[PDB]
């Protein structure tokens, strides 16, 4: 897909929709079976349309900026625990020309505490969106199991919204969250 | 993949292993967007290997029964709120046998109240397996969006464990989908 600089993405015409996406993650010393290290807890969401994506949403008229809407979309999607933290410009990573009509996507990534992250998993089922535009949260498995396939490689065979799969890969590399 | 009656599978030597799956569902009057009926809320686990499947698991020998073992497995995976109900032999649907691995797979379905099922979802992250063998719970979308693609058919392009996708399609056919 077509990478764009943030400023050129804000410059696009009035017929463009802007959509904001957050990778929310925290460190995880946990060990699966006491032997495979999780390394980090990273969240993704099953969308209404059967696809895996990131938390976020379309920025609306009364949004004074990308971040105020992003955070607003998160609270609607994840519930009150999202209020504990605020995704900010420093967390911004990239902007992409999405798919379909005139849509451009902004990708953020925000390190939390494991308690913060867990507190968002635990309340996510009382949110406005849940059971409607949102079907379920899952953690991205960062390990590859003994048969060579189960874990991350298998998990990437799933359906992703737009280009989420590519943004995820890029972010695990840039943030060093594998190997 | 062959189909077996229960007593046939229960006769088989002790070294054969047993795996038991439960499809938990509940009527959901909900309307997605105000326009698309949900009909039923059904739950699926995303297992540790990246594959989606029903809650369930292997029986160990401290499990007396197919059902104790199944019901043991659900408490571990979904938490305390699984105790609201017990999956019984009356909810048995079928059994299947594989090629290579010597395991019989038994399939169950258990009708909940919607509040029962939401308590299972709400309580799910305090379950022992959460963040280890279970990565999270999804609902199954039973609709198809206008495009013929978004919804159930895309949900079906995910990766699944074993006979889950099939077991789901089987259960949807009986329910009136
Ligand atoms: Na599991």
Q: What is the set of domains in chain B, with CATH numbers?
A: 1-177 (3.90.79.10)
Angle at A150 between CA A149 and CA A156, to 5 degrees: 85
Tokens of A48: 């209404």
Which of these, B56, B53, B55, lies nearest to B20 by C-alpha position?
B56
Dist. CA A152–CA A142, nearest whole Å: 6
Q: Structure solved using which method?
A: X-ray
Other residues' Cβ atoms within 10 Å of the Cβ of residue A161 = 21
Interface of B with A in 122-141 (CB under 8 A): 122, 124-126, 130-133, 135-141
Dist. CA A162–CA A1, nearest whole Å: 10
CA dihedral angle for residue B103, residue B48, residue A70, residue A85, rounded to 10 degrees:
140
This PDB structure is determined at a resolution in Å of 2.6
CA dihedral angle for residue B50, residue B53, residue B59, residue B62, rounded to 10 degrees:
80
Q: Do A50 and B141 touch (CB under 8 A)?
A: yes
Number of A–B residue contacts, CB under 8 Å: 101
Q: Which of A30, A50, A156 sits opposite B132 (nearest CB)?
A: A30
Contacts of A48 in chain B (CB under 8 A): 32, 141, 150-151
Exposure b/e, B101-139, CB count within 10 A at least 16 = b? eeebbbbbbbebebebbbbbbbbbbebebbbbbbbbbbb
**Residue B148 burial by CB count (10 A; 0-12/13-18/19+): exposed, middle or buried?**
exposed
Q: Do B136 and A141 touch (CB under 8 A)?
A: no
Q: Do A49 and B141 touch (CB under 8 A)?
A: yes
| SS3 label, residue A168 | helix
Question: B109 vs chain A: nearest CA distance in angstroms?
Answer: 20
CA dihedral angle for residue A25, residue A31, residue A37, residue A38, rounded to 10 degrees:
-20
Contacts of B130 in chain A (CB under 8 A): 121
**Residue A12 in contact with partner chain B when CB distance is under 8 A:** no
Find all residues with CB under 8 Å of B68, minimum gap 6, and list them.
none
């Amino acid at each position: 897909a077509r990478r764009l600089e943030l400023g050129e993405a804000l410059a696009l015409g009035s017929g463009w929709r802007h959509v904001c996406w957050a990778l929310l993650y925290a460190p995880d010393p946990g060990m699966l079976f006491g032997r495979i290290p999780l390394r980090y807890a990273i969240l993704m969401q099953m969308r209404f349309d059967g696809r895996l994506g990131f938390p976020g949403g379309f920025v609306d008229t009364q949004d004074r900026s990308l971040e105020d809407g992003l955070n607003r979309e998160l609270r609607e999607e994840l519930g009150e625990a999202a209020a504990a933290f605020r995704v900010e410009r420093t967390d911004y990573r990239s902007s992409h020309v999405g798919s379909g009509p005139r849509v451009v996507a902004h990708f953020y990534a925000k390190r939390l505490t494991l308690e913060e992250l867990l507190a968002v998993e635990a309340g996510a089922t009382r949110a406005k969106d849940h059971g409607l535009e949102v079907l379920g949260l899952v953690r991205v498995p960062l390990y590859t199991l003994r048969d060579g396939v189960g874990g991350l490689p298998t998990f990437l065979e799933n359906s992703f919204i737009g280009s989420a799969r590519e943004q995820l890969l890029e972010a695990l590399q840039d943030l060093g969250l594998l190997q």
